[PDB]
A paper describes a structure:
RSKs and MSKs are composed of a N-terminal kinase domain (NTKD), a linker region and a C-terminal kinase domain (CTKD), and both kinase domains have adenosine triphosphate (ATP) binding sites. The RSKs are activated by phosphorylation of the activation loop in the CTKD by ERK1/217, and MSKs similarly by ERK1/2 or p38 MAPK. The linker region is phosphorylated by the activated CTKD, and hereby activates the NTKD for phosphorylation of downstream targets. We find that DMF inhibits RSK/MSK kinases primarily by covalent binding to a conserved cysteine residue placed at an allosteric site, and that this interaction is likely to represent an important component of the mechanism of action of DMF as a clinical drug.
We determined the structure of RSK2CTKD co-crystallized with excess DMF at 1.9 Å resolution by X-ray crystallography. Overall, the structure resembles that of the inactive RSK2CTKD (PDB ID 2QR819, RSMD 0.41 Å for all Cα atoms), but a DMF modification of C599 in the α-helix F (αF) was readily apparent from unbiased electron density maps and further confirmed by the refined structure, as was a less well-defined modification site at C436 at the empty ATP binding pocket. Focusing on the C599 site, the ester group adjacent to the two-carbon of the dimethyl 2-S-succinate adduct is stacked to W602, and a weak hydrogen bond is formed between the linking ester oxygen and R667. Hydrophobic interactions are furthermore formed with I633 and L710 of αG and αL, respectively. A stabilized interaction between αL and the C-terminal helix bundle via the hydrophobic interactions between the modified C599 and L710 of αL furthermore contribute to the DMF-bound state. Structural comparison with the activated state of related kinases suggests that the activation loop and αF undergoes large structural rearrangements during RSK/MSK activation. The C599 site, however, is situated at a central hinge of αF, and covalent modification of C599 by DMF impairs the movement of the activation loop by steric hindrance. However, the partially occupied DMF modification of C436 in the ATP pocket could also potentially inhibit RSK2 by blocking ATP binding. On the other hand, access to C579 in the activation loop was blocked by a crystal contact and therefore remained unaccounted for from the crystal structure analysis. We propose that the tightly packed environment of the DMF-modified C599 site (RSK2) provides a robust inhibition of RSK/MSK kinases.
Author numbering: 415 to 428, 434 to 579, 583 to 712
């Protein structure tokens, strides 16, 4: 009945994502406009409906379906990408890096336990809702690739009936891939450069050759100022073998997360090239998805 046009005014582009105005309040929101002939966003909407009330998951405000497009209205992120803000802070410290990773990983731990893998958890999908710089303002966004574990009969399941074994191991693989991207995030927060790519021009083959070799530098340079506890966690999040990589639950038990209050609060020594990083990250995830 009531359409999206009726309660909202559409504004500039930000699937297609636009800014909009709720007419009764003049508050502003984001709407993701989804072409039903391209893809079925039932999964994405079910996940946002069930789980968007989490303080650190993007919150769903309104949904409409006109038969062509689905309109998914959410809070509008006004604080930009997390990594963009953090890489431009000269005085950022491991203690702040740990508070950020804690907030994010606690959210991922909750999702995985509810049977949800994100599958697109790159840094540019992790944003700040406002400019406060507070970890509470973090939001994980874009669940367009996420998946709920289900049984054969359609019944929502949690990893703790009958689910096909290859649905389970694939879910396991997907959850590990989620943690690996949080590893990429951590590495980059600590040093100002990404682990597998130097810039947007790195070839996909060389990025994948680095990923597949399971090796990345944890010593020297920007890493001289960084604690062993941090390096240890990074190494266990980026481990190339998903069977050996930490889970979200184990990340939260690492002393770098638990003992944050013993972490150095002096400034990290980092590359300052946030725009280079952005292109290196895009190159890294392009190589991955192919
Ligand atoms: C309402 O959803 C959007 O505005 C799409 C963009 C996005 O979520 O990027 C992280
Ligand atoms: C299929 O993609 C993934 O498994 C992402 C994580 C990963 O590449 O670890 C090496
Ligand atoms: Na939320």
């Amino acid at each position: 009945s009531i359409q999206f046009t009726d309660g909202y005014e559409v504004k500039e582009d930000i699937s297609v994502c636009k800014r909009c105005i709720h007419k009764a309040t003049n508050m502003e929101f984001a709407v993701k406009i989804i072409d039903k002939s391209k893809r079925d966003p039932t999964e994405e909407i079910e996940i946002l409906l069930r789980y968007g009330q989490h303080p650190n998951i993007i919150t769903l405000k309104d949904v409409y379906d006109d038969g062509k497009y689905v309109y998914v209205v959410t809070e509008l992120m006004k604080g930009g990408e997390l990594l963009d803000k953090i890489l431009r802070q000269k005085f950022f410290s491991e203690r702040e890096a740990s508070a950020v990773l804690f907030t994010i990983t606690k959210t991922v731990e909750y999702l995985h336990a509810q049977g949800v893998v994100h599958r697109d958890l790159k840094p540019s999908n992790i944003l700040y809702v406002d400019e406060s710089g507070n970890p509470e303002s973090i939001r994980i966004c874009d669940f367009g690739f996420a998946k709920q574990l289900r049984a054969e009969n359609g019944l929502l399941m949690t990893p703790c009936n009958f689910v096909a074994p290859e649905v389970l191991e694939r879910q396991g693989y997907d959850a590990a891939c989620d943690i690996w991207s949080l590893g990429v995030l951590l590495y980059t927060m600590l040093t100002g450069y990404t682990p597998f790519a130097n810039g947007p021009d790195d070839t996909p083959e060389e990025i994948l050759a680095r990923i597949g070799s399971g090796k990345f530098s944890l010593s020297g340079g920007y890493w001289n100022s960084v604690s062993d506890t941090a390096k240890d966690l990074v190494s266990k999040m980026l481990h190339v073998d998903p069977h050996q990589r930490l889970t979200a639950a184990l990340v939260l038990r690492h002393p770098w997360i638990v003992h944050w209050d013993q972490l150095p609060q002096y400034q990290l020594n980092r590359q300052d090239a946030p725009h280079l990083v952005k292109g290196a990250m895009a190159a890294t995830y392009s190589a991955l998805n192919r």
